[PDB]
Prior knowledge:
The structure is cut from a larger assembly and holds four copies of chain A.
Chain A (H helix, E strand, L loop, with lengths): L1 H15 L11 E6 L5 H9 L17 E5 L6 E4 L6 E2 L3 H17 L12 E5 L7 E2 L18 H13 L4 E8 L8 H9 L6 E6 L1 H6 L4 H9 L9 E4 L11 H13 L2 H4 L10 H41 L8 H17 L1
Amino acid sequence: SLIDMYSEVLDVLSDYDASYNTQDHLPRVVVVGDQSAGKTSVLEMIAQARIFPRGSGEMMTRSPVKVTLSEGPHHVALFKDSSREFDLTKEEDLAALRHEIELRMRKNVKEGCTVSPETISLNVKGPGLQRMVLVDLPGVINTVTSGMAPDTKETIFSISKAYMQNPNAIILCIQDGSVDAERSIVTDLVSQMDPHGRRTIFVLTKVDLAEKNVASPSRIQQIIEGKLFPMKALGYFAVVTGKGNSSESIEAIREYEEEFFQNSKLLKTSMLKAHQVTTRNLSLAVSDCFWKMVRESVEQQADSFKATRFNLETEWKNNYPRLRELDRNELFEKAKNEILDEVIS
Amino acid sequence: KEVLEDFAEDGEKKIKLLTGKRVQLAEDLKKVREIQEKLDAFIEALHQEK
Amino acid sequence: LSQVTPKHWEEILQQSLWERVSTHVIENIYLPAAQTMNSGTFNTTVDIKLKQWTDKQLPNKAVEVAWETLQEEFSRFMTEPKGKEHDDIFDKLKEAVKEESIKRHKWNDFAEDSLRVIQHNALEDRSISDKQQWDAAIYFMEEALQARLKDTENAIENMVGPDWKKRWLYWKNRTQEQCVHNETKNELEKMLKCNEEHPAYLASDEITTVRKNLESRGVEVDPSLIKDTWHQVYRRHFLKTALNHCNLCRRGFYYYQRHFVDSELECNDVVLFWRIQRMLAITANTLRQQLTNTEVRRLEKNV
Amino acid sequence: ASDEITTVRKNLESRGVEVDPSLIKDTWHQVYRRHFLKTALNHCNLCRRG
């Protein structure tokens, strides 16, 4: 609905302005994750459909995907360059869509590289879906894979930094709950790049696995309440991505996560706030904050665009008052007609 | 007529041949106006929901 | 106070408002746009600058100017000495009430928004149908240019001094720095004479060429001083060039009457100044009517 | 020196003449040689009674 137009506006802005002079004035959602950190599961959980390719420890996400969640009569996903609709309600179409996405990732790869910086805009429709735009990025690997290009890690870092360059962009960090914050570089980079924390949001995965590992409650509470981390963010949320299997259904994972947290002793002991868990609470808070920032930003952009267009029109009148503006195609038609006239003359 | 049809099917040649202040002004105005129209529709639809 | 002829109010308001904004208009708008030789780009820059300034700053300045003029007449009438018959006991009470009334004064908030559109449409016209209006704009431009030229001459005279003929008559001797500035002036004179359409900005290699000629005269001058002298010289030269343009444009109304766009006598400046003069006349009349009607009741209420 | 060439070239442009730096260098070499020889001749006259 509304977010469909917002996504279209962003796409046209990127095409019109190759640089980020104007693209850095609108809010955005940036997602950065490590290897096997459940970044794909979290994005799939929000989209309520497993549309990304799955691999046994291999980084299937070889190209960034701009996944857009909108309001639609049916839960379907549509490519920007292709009109072939894919029904996410059927598992057979989901598998075909995953293969198509992987094929698009390989096609966009240039010569001499493994991961291409090009982003593919995907519109995932569905009734009741949150109206927001998500960005999928390749996982950050501590050790460079032998089968990948030597600059793949640098390309991933550059893409994440370019996305984070927008002062209104919302940071969505994804890591693993079984790995300490000192063993991951992504959390350090996020804290360094956002000293204020006015837009940083941290997402922790495999919370059930961490609890089954007998994690210290103090560390979990400090992470959620922002004590261990020097940065002071708006808030912290924890979600469960299941048991880690690549074939588990989304509905079973969500139901299991809700039951696990309902019967969890930590929540009933009031160690962690009840509204700081579950994906529904996080999605609602992110959507409301993102939409409010979009409303203010779009008003400023609309006034600026109107003024800019007025200046262009004024220049046209001053230079060419007795002429009409035509595009490249129309000028070609006018030119050929003049040629035919000269032939007759 | 044959030459024009071949030229019409190749937009790259048109871009190289059509370089001028008038051409750029028209193209930029079209793009800016198109973006502005989308922004107006987005703003109006957003504000009419409530 | 309301028994004064409207002409007196309009003359005071027009002169005060014009002098209040003349410096900002000429320096911040006219000068940057006049650098370009393209009339279309020149006009486009002027229109963009006008819209930006008018939509936010013009109503505030007009309100302050109108209120200040009302304050001058009102405060004076409170303290006008009526010869030897003037009483002094009431003067203390008059001043106390005057200060309190001024603090409680509050101009209409909707006047600023209404006037913004009013002068916007007034300035949007680009046709001069009256021959006398064209002549009036020329005279108005000449007076404004002469005032700016006199200030430029004063700064140049301070940096250099009187002419050798004049300094001999007055028995004044130039200082060493003054003579240095005079030599720099001669160098800039030759540079401007050769290239009559030199850009306002300077270049490093130009400074080196000027400095070497100064060394040929046994004078060492820092690049900063040369840049400052060049700025003043260019301003004076541009003002003189505009004056010559005014003389050429004096008989250009007939050419403009036939829309001789192809003719090189494109008196864009005269049209722009005429728009400003017309806008000032409308603004003065509108403020006079508002002062005579809108704010009299508020003044009475506060009293 | 290069800046000397620029100063000479600008004076030539003031006369409406465009000259390449190579030509200026060649002319300067011949002029300096002639000037130096004349200077030596003046030195000979002074050194006559030396």
